[PDB]
Amino acid sequence: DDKDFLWPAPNEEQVTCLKMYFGHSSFKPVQWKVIHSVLEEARDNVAVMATGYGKSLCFQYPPVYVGKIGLVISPLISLMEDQVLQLKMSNIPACFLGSAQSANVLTDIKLGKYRIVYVTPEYCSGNMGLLQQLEADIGITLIAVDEAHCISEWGHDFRDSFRKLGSLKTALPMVPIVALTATASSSIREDIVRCLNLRNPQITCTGFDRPNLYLEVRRKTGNILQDLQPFLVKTSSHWEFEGPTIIYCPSRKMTQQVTGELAKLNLSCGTYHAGMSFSTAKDIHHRFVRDEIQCVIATIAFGMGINKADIRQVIHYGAPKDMESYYQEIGRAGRDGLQSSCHVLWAPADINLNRHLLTEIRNAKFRLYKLKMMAKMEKYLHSSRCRRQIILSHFEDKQVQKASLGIMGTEKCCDNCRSALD
Template sequence: MPLTAREILKKYFGYDNFRPGQEEIIQHIIAGNDTLVLMPTGGGKSICYQVPALMLDGTCIVISPLISLMKDQVDTLKGNGIAAAYLNSSQEYPEQQEILESCYKGKIALLYVSPEKLISELSMITQMARPSMFAIDEAHCISEWGHDFRPEYIQLGLLRERFGHIPFVALTATADKVTRKDIIRQLSLKKPTTFISSFNRPNLSLEVRTGTPPGQKLLEVIQFVRKHKNQSGIIYCSSRNKCEDVTTALKNAGISATFYHAGMSASARARVQEDFINDNTQVVCATIAFGMGIDKSNVRWVIHFNLPKNMESYYQEIGRAGRDGLPAETVLYYSYADLTILSKFASESTQSEMNLEKLARMQHYAEADICRRKILLNYFSENLQENCGNCDVCQYPRQHFDGTVLVQKALSAIARTGEKESAGMIIDILRGSVRSEITEAGYDKLKTHGAGSGISGVDWQRYLMQMLHLGILEMAYDENFALKITHYGREILFGRQKAALTILPPLKAREKKTDSQAREVFYYEDELFENLRQTRKKFSAEEDVPAYIIFSDATLQEMARFKPVTEREMLEITGVGEHKFDKYGAVFIRTIDSFLKKRRINQHRALK
């Protein structure tokens, strides 16, 4: 008798219950309906097509954009006892033929294929694999409105016309309303139902650090990584050079780090990714080229060294942290310089209006003085009623002051220079600089020269960003980023309006209030957890697969907390299915039993 969806979930994945929305999506697909699934990174999208693939006759063809992502997912499925394979350019022809023959014989439940490979060899692949369904992963890649558009995805719309009798499911972690509509249109989905799961990842803390000087930023990052000893993390940088510079600084500080960007050879990038996945490298400094291929569950933190260009990219990148559901930290550094550079790129792009608007939303998030998670979720059309309590704004509520005089000083300097200077020049005038550019222009004679000398240059940058955000100023990107005074700004300048500014939070890194609370919730025995990690590491080395494919950190922590020593107890641990118990269970039980015996001996000795 065929297994039910819940029986498959327990047998192969080791979970007793589906996450919200998963079971409904699975039943919808099994009924033969087209489906669009939006779930956050780490939210369980894969289960939504992997379970139906084990219930339907034939092979589920999964269209995936990256070779590394295919390999990772296939290794994970095989680790769970599920027959899966992939086809891509890394394989020789005989190996590909052998895989297709296995599909024809009904031995492969899921076949991962790149869009280029599928379209170029469509007839042969579908004749041999006899598809039961199509799953289009990272579906936002098909839309020009998406943040990671890929032209090769466009041809996938032909599939729906050719295979009208089987269900299609499109899945993505990041798509606004416009992108969702475009995915449906481009793929020619038939009356699809759209399932949108909550984008809330409460285990991720959100912090933004504004106006931190470059040198101090590097010192803070080094201190942060040292505080998170032996914890995997990613640092996203805006350029290849910046990736390499940050990596050098970390290495000089004795930290295991490397860089990853598009300027490297494919083999070098693959090597970096393998080392990171296998915990041989603690930190990767990367451009946005590093992301979709990472299915590593125990990334404990993500730092954005520079401002991302849109909310979709930011959300997807912070989503690399805490996929196991355990607490994880995210830090975003925000500076006027980043905003200037990104504004220039956006204004010169082919879709300048859209890209500038997306950047403005990113700026709104970075400058927020209300709960950041509310802004983040609102971007994806989700409302959070209560403050999250796990972002820097919630933990350190913003206070305001009457900044009218301060604002008037800045506006006066801007007006007296003819509204043709950028922020750097205005700050120098306010600070009373006498560098040659100031004196040659006669700005040292202005009434406002030195009027703001009591405020540091860094804090002036932060105040100017507030003024931009409040609509007091605007930036003329096509005039070398000159600052212009808005109508509202003129009302303040001439005393007809007042300006409330946020009291600047200190630049130094602050301890999270929730650190101790998080450890209480996820309490486990450190020594036993480390013993279990070493046991997992041996299996990982023997099988040449990433450690988290054996068991995730979350599963090991649950073992360390509940200490299962029987088959029944071990099968109750989340993430331990029948296949994994048969393969690893006895050894992990011996590790736990050995730990408990050692503790009893030590306790007995202590009593003597």
Template sequence: MTSTLLAQQSEASPQTILEDVFGYQHFRQGQLEVIEASLSGQDSVVIMPTGGGKSLCYQIPALVHTGLTLVISPLISLMKDQVDQLKADGVAAECVNSTMSREALISVYNRMRSGDLKLVYVSPERVLMHDFIERLQNINLSMIAVDEAHCISQWGHDFRPEYAAIGQLKNYFPHVPFMALTATADDATRGDIIHRLNLVNPHDYLGSFDRPNIHYNLVEKHKPVSQVIRYVQTNKGQCGIIYCGSRKKVEMVTEKLCNNHIRAAGYHAGMDVDERAYVQEAFQRDDIQIVVATVAFGMGINKPNVRFVVHFDIPRNIESYYQETGRAGRDGLPAEAMMLYDPADIGWLRRMLDEKDEGPQKQVESHKLNAMVAFAEAQTCRRQVLLNYFGEYREKPCGNCDICVDPPKRFDATQEAQKALSCVYRVNQGFGIGYVVEVLRGMQNIRVRENGHDKLSTYGIGRDHSHDYWVSVFRQLIHKGLLSQNITRNSTLQLTEEARPLLRGEMKLELAVPRLDTAARSAKSDKLSSKNYDKKLFAKLRKLRKSIADEDGLPPYVVFSDATLIDMAEILPTSYGEMLAVNGVGQRKLDKYADAFLDLIQEHITIHG
């Protein structure tokens, strides 16, 4: 039975559709529970981690139901990506968006009316248009799914007014089950989603927020561009996303990467639509390795084989961090989230926040920023801190973050702290970290001499340690509350009352030993090395996949994901039956692609045994 025929048979069970259409043998945790609630006609709120299989929660009911499932999605690129994948699996799906011609729109509307389509993806702006609602009222509508539902809530980190109006649809379709899905929503956001969508006694599924395949890693920001270049070079050939806090930084980092012969491209809201579409498509098709982006690049990415996400600057909140790091490892294979951290970045974010009008929204943003800082400055398992924020508690450390793998070592830093604080005092509390470190280390430069600071008693008393060592010490003193940074005066250092007992020798102080090997520390340089598969065959399979994808005008992962190719390189299927047993190979893809891949595998076995 082909998947297209199967999609038209309402008596097919969820398990049969999972196997024959999507090529998977087992449901992930929570999927079947949500699917059954939807099939019973119940509204649902679904919180599942990025890469946790949210899409199947509405796609499978859509293929069981006899009518049309409408999927509301915030980005055209995300709609197109989902529709491409569904079509590759033999499912009748289309999208409706502002880039389509009148003829193309009429064709989709006619197919909706005739019952030819199972899923239609649409933007929140389009779905609320009067003529579109009229069209929906004249067809058999079986379900409405709202993707990225956190955009509905004013308490969410990505609130969009046009999304908040979607709740009006419940007035037009009171008996149609709704399903709201997101990866990031705390209790307040979940409650707001239910209220704004007018959901009736919804089935509330809260899955684990844990992404066990992601290694969380935070390093001190010293020479960030050099650190990023070395990190990418360490992960040679692997796809990644680098998030920056501004367009200017995006352009600067992209230029430096390209100058170092790394296939990278920038992406930000200041680029025109065609430029952004080109970069996104090139990344989806593996034509470029790295995208350097602002937060404008995110929700539209469904690329499974992103092996790392780097934050060049700290995000404003944990929800953004979680969602952006969630772009890595969607295929379930090992991946890494690496963040460069400088407390001065927090000072800048606080300054931006201070300029906003007082009110509940400002309070929420301040709370979220404080939680982000707590995560960045944690001395315990980062995964525990991250999950605790979302109300999920783990007794044992994860063993897969920088704190667990290499716990911070402590030392008696009383003398170092006294030297640092004394130097801040001697320069009249009028300079930032970089300058004070130059005085401490006895650097010979014009500015120090012109200020007469080469004559100070503290000049050169710290020359036994490196620049980065002292920067780390100063940052820890700020975190401990012994120093503050005046963000209105170029982040100049100032002593606090808490510094006085230390300077007078009335207390001792322990700090973490500065980590100076921050350039390219990562969990593994080859994040897939622990998998037991034929590496040479995997490389050949990827090359074949790229060739087929280019010929069909598709992103490579729509043909097969990396996880599926790794299964092939491990199982070494030589027949249709064995190929169907590979995760991610359904009937439609077997019919379309199996011969080429089986031939390559057989050829490899013949040559290499």
């Protein structure tokens, strides 16, 4: 059930609004992540989606729920007109605001009668005072910037009309921005984050099947060097991995132990955990991105905001505690689209320890959410079925699942597919 992934749970008023104005009885997990971050945290977002299926709900739902205004900035005039028309058909007041609009329509926007207002980036930069007035008198729930990759000079479609959207955060500092694009390029994404002046944005990336990620689950011995030796290559008088690697561990103590063994081999590596000083954490991050260290041995604390496309290997040294956390972690591998591998090395004792630590969570609702995330991970680790099929069924839509049927069953899919093949 994908309702298990919704943290925190949507309330009855939110569900009633979804059914009444959008015709859905439930939120998809990625939509809920964006909607909740906007409503409760006013958080900036970068939502990358391979297709337009379920994209508009992320930015249309929040202003409708709070009865305020959502501004949508896009250069796709005909699509914006179609979306305005579909909103009106659902009894949601919406309009395309341009230089040709009537004074009667602009007066109703100023009075807070329209929930969604679509504008071009050119109209937006020429009428900032209007947006400041709307924020002061009504309140803008969010600003959605569609085709956000157009603000990047290294993208395939740079538009100067988008560069000016860099002033949105200075004109409207409390308004969260939801940048939308179909490109999953991590380098283009860094430029979107910077040029729009987004602060700690939540990043989501959905609709991609990623056949370049090989998945394997293997039993551990707990003898660290014995477990990691198959991944190592003797190079001169020291040892190395095939490429940039992240080893995710369940604890700070395990990161020190694993790094200690790899340091004995003079492997280029560093430790990362939330117990380190700010300067030491910055240096490991800096050295990994500059390729001055090949391998980072880390807790869950490492990973977000790393613009690194050539992570060739992710190793989870110990059973992951949470299926959702595992998904974010392996998603950091092979963002350049080249072959990468994601291996879990685990033992039943790791799961028993993980379960004991779960009893330490004081918030009962959160503890149950975490318990459900752990149960999904345990089932995945013990499974003899396709690993890719399990993961996509938990996190992706039916189209992406359907698209993965081409690699499923083949020698490049996962360890279970290779074992079933021969």
